[PDB]
Amino acid sequence: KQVAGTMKLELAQYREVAAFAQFGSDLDAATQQLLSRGVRLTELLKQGQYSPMAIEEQVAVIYAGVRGYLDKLEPSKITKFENAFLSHVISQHQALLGKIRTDGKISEESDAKLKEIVTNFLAGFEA
Amino acid sequence: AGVGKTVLIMELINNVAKAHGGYSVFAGVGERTREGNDLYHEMIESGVINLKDATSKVALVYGQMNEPPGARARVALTGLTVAEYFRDQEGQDVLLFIDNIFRFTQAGSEVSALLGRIPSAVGYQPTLATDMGTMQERITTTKKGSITSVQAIYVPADDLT
Amino acid sequence: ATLKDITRRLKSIKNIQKITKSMKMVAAAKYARAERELKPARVYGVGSLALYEKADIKTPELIIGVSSDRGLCGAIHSSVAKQMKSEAANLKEVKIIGVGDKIRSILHRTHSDQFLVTFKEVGRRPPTFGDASVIALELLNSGYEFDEGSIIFNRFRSVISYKTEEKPIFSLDTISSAESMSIYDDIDADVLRNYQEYSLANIIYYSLKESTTSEQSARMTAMDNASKNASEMIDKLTLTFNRTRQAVITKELIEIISGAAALD
Amino acid sequence: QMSFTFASPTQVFFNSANVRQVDVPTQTGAFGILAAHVPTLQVLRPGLVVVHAEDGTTSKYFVSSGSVTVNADSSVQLLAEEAVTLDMLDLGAAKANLEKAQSELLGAADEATRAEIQIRIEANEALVKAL
Amino acid sequence: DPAPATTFAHLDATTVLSRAIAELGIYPAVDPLDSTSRIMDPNIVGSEHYDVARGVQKILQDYKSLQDIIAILGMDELSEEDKLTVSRARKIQRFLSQPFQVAEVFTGHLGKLVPLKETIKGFQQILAGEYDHLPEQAFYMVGPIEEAVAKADKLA
Amino acid sequence: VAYWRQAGLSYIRYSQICAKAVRDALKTEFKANAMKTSGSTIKIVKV
């Protein structure tokens, strides 16, 4: 709920305006941004077939974008991230992932740990 | 769907049932049974359905999808008949919540066809208008009350003519 | 006929509607800018004429048109087109100049090497003074200069409207020569002449911009029109649609039933 | 008592403003135009525009060039090319540009180039003037 | 509709009244690009007569073609010749119109009646575009093109 | 015209070198804007 509600919502907003993604390539920034964010969110919607998932991953990855961190990284490279980052957190912050999974929500901490994680990891991924 | 819709309805039920001394008939017409269970729960929840009085604001008739077409079709008159009781007889200001009359329409419609009877064009009941009529004319302010119908209407095919 | 065909229409017509509207705000932005930015210019270009209607011009003999650069330009381009092929011969010689590549896109279509060069980027990002100076410069070396011109642009009035305006050239130093013009002077026809220069840019800029101002708002206008128009049209189809749509069903049920009114 | 229209493409600085004088680096020579001034066009040097506004002001500018248009009547139209307040002009550059200029001059073979270079020098210099 | 669908076959003359046109209030309200005579075919009828028609028939038809484009697009990125035809067509359109002689009760107007020459010429004249500065609608509800010319004129 | 018709240059050219030099000069934020306002952005494209 904490990431997704907003995301849906964000996608709506993106989407009317995804209409004029094409042209409406020339407007105000907010909206240009919305497209950018949107696009970012889109990458997430590109997802594998041959591909199941845990919630924590799902939110993880969403978290990144919805926390706008993807809005730094470029759309194709989101994808690169997505695997990589995911596998990364999977490796390292497996600790954390256990926790998020467990906690079923996102804890503030988890969030914080995430926040930082993503950002660094991201910093590394987008490094 | 439940834009506080459901709620709104409940509120209406609330206002009227009170305000005119009214009472209501709810026909969960083709109710999606689970959703009617759910529905229950809101009402209960809301207390508008009082378990503390089966003299809640609303009489519930639920006529779910799993019932025959006929059954789904007919629950509407059943309810309708009730509202005439409450109207005239209880003197009350009945609300007839028809939910959805469209789901009725469908329920009837299936019947007309299925009777092999030609229903009007596109399957529309032959008698679609009289079906409606026969039902509809049983709604009014008589003198001993009024049954004001609150008709949930799903605009079939978003098509109106 | 078939709901399909109808969709070929509809589909795209919706698309258009949106798009047309897309073009609209865009145009509006362009426009928005176009007013605002018009201000110093306003003064400035108005400035150019200052002594050019107080300085009175025996035009001694660079006809140029200013319009859009784009499809969806309304009659921005057409107006000047009209009014500039009508001209071209007198000021002597058929030489025409298009600033605005929609100028010469209608008067491209009726002259071409009577132009010397023609300019774009007028639209598709909006003009600047520099540019006006650049063209101002080129105008000179082209000896059409000294055969006089008129400078025709879309003088904005309001978003919807401009009045294609025209002036006659004053970048000739043979206007800077003599005439009663001289008697308004206490300065030689050099630094005057080097104003004929300087002013060519000023005005050219101005006009250039005026045109584009006219244009951009008209470009919205075009975009209004269309997207409404599109809407109406959609509406109509939408009836016809359902009708046939339903019709089918009826007919179909018919065909079945009447097929059930036939042997099997 | 001059309606001073001081404008540049970018700006109108004074617009028919009751300026008492503008002291003019019109290509001419130093001239302080007050009020109405004879129909004459005199073209402007790069200089400063000092806008003796009829009130003690002198507004400062450096002007790149342009024309003064002196319209018979009360009105002066300084149509200054790039006439900028000295504020936004760049001293560091003026010298630097001038050195650089001096480098350029040498390659400003052909008077038209030179013209530009000497101009540049003049410019940079002129920037050195007040900056 | 099959019934009419059939009918055409039977028809020496198929007379299609255009409701569309009719709606424009126009009388003659015909859909003449639907109304035919097989003897509409050059030779037979004097092919000039016909040809004069062929230019028109064309002109209007092309003009008809434009109508989707125009319907949205109106005018200003199209082409000039067409702009002329448009106007001309617009006259032609009007020129077919003729009020009702009998049904002055209906028309108010007196209707008109036109023999061949003014007809052949009439439109042909429009083909010559002799009117292209003459008020376009003025061809409306006329018989002779002359009178139509007149109808433009009183105006200017 | 010391060279603004006497070593070429127009008032246009002369001036334009001035402005250009002003742009050459000026502080940079302003110089960004240079290419915008009054920065020649003619595209000399016949059509």
Coordinates of C-alpha atoms in Angstrom, one line a residue, chain C residues 74-75 225-226, chain E residues 71-72 76-77:
Chain C
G74 CA -3.7 28.7 -40.9
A75 CA -3.6 31.5 -43.4
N225 CA -10.6 24.0 -34.4
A226 CA -9.6 20.7 -35.4
Chain E
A71 CA -14.8 18.7 -42.5
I72 CA -12.1 19.0 -40.0
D76 CA -5.9 26.7 -45.1
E77 CA -3.2 24.2 -46.0

